[PDB]
C-alpha cells in the first residue's frame, strides 16, 4: 500500500457483456485492492467492474 | 450488496487533522474494503482517507452526522 | 524432493490469449526467473517476465 | 522454451521399488545432477544419483 | 566397450518364473550389452536370461 | 532361434594373431551381438574375439573349417 487518496477496487464483475459501443475507455485496478479487475468506462461515464479473464473482456480491450 | 460498481477503497491515512473548515461530508469505506477507513470529502471535492479511531477524525465526524 | 519446473529460455513470438488457460512463476531456487503459461493441452511455455505482452496476458489470467 | 524439472533436494528414505514405474535423469541445464522415480500416482521424487539404492533402483527400471 | 574378452548378453527373457529353490546366483549383464538383463544361474549351472523388470525378478533378488 | 540363453558378445578385437598351434575351434558371433566377430577357443579354453575381416583370421578359419 502507497498514498491517503482513496483507490477504485472492485468486488463483483458484470454478468452479461456491456455494448462495446458504449464504451469509451477501460483501466486495470490498483494491485492494491484484493481483487483484480478492468473497469469499463461507458458513454454516460458509469464505471463497470469486469472478469480480466473473460472472453469479452479481452476481445473489448484486443479492439478498443 | 456487492454489485459491478467500484467501491472507494484506503490504503494510507493522513498523517496530520485536516482543517475543519474545509470539509463538508464524510463516510465510511466499505466493510470489503480490506481496511477500515473514514473519508473526509474537501471543499474542492477530495476524498482523504483517515484513521478511523484517531480522536480528530472522530470529533469531525460528530461535527458532521445528524446521528 | 519434488522436482519444479524451470526455464532456460523464452518464447520469441507471443502464443495466442485463446491457447492458455493460465499461469505461474517458476521457483526462486530455478537459475532463471520465467513466467510459464499453461495451454489447452498443458503444456508450459516458458516467457520473459518483463515482456509487455507478458504482463498484459498475466493481467487477463489466473495463476495457478 | 518448453519447462524442464529440476531437483534441489534427495529423499532420504528410499521410497519402496513396488510403487515406481520409471525413471529418468533431469536435463544437464539443471543446476544439481538428479535421478527422478516417478511413482504410480505419476509424483516425481528426486533422488541422489551416487546412492547405491538408487543404482540398484534404476537397474531394475525403464527410462522415460 | 573396454577387452577381446566375451562377454554375457541377453537377448529374450525368460517367460516363466524359474523355481526360487533352483538359484544359486544372479548377475546383471554388462552395459555394454545393447538390453538391460539378469541372468540366473541354476543348481545345474544353466544361465537364464530375465527381465529386471519383472516383479518375480525383483522379489528373487531382493529374498536371496 | 531369439531364446533365455545368454550369447557371448565381443566389444573389442585382439591386437596381435594369437599363435596357431594354440587355438583348438572357433566359432562366429551371433549377428544379434552389435558387432561382428571371430572367436578363437584355446587349448586352455579362452575364448579370444578377433577381427574377422583380418587376414591372419581368415587363414586361421581355412585351416580349421571342414566346409
Given at each position: 500500500?502507497?498514498?491517503?487518496d482513496?483507490?477504485?477496487?472492485?468486488?463483483?464483475?458484470?454478468?452479461?457483456?456491456?455494448?462495446?459501443?458504449?464504451?469509451?475507455?477501460?483501466?486495470?485496478?490498483?494491485?492494491?485492492?484484493?481483487?483484480?479487475?478492468?473497469?469499463?468506462?461507458?458513454?454516460?461515464?458509469?464505471?463497470?467492474?469486469?472478469?480480466?479473464?473473460?472472453?469479452?473482456?479481452?476481445?473489448?480491450?484486443?479492439?478498443?
Amino acid at each position: 500500500p502507497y498514498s491517503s487518496d482513496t483507490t477504485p477496487c472492485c468486488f463483483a464483475y458484470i454478468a452479461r457483456p456491456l455494448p462495446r459501443a458504449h464504451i469509451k475507455e477501460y483501466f486495470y485496478t490498483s494491485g492494491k485492492c484484493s481483487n483484480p479487475a478492468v473497469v469499463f468506462v461507458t458513454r454516460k461515464n458509469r464505471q463497470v467492474c469486469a472478469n480480466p479473464e473473460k472472453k469479452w473482456v479481452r476481445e473489448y480491450i484486443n479492439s478498443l
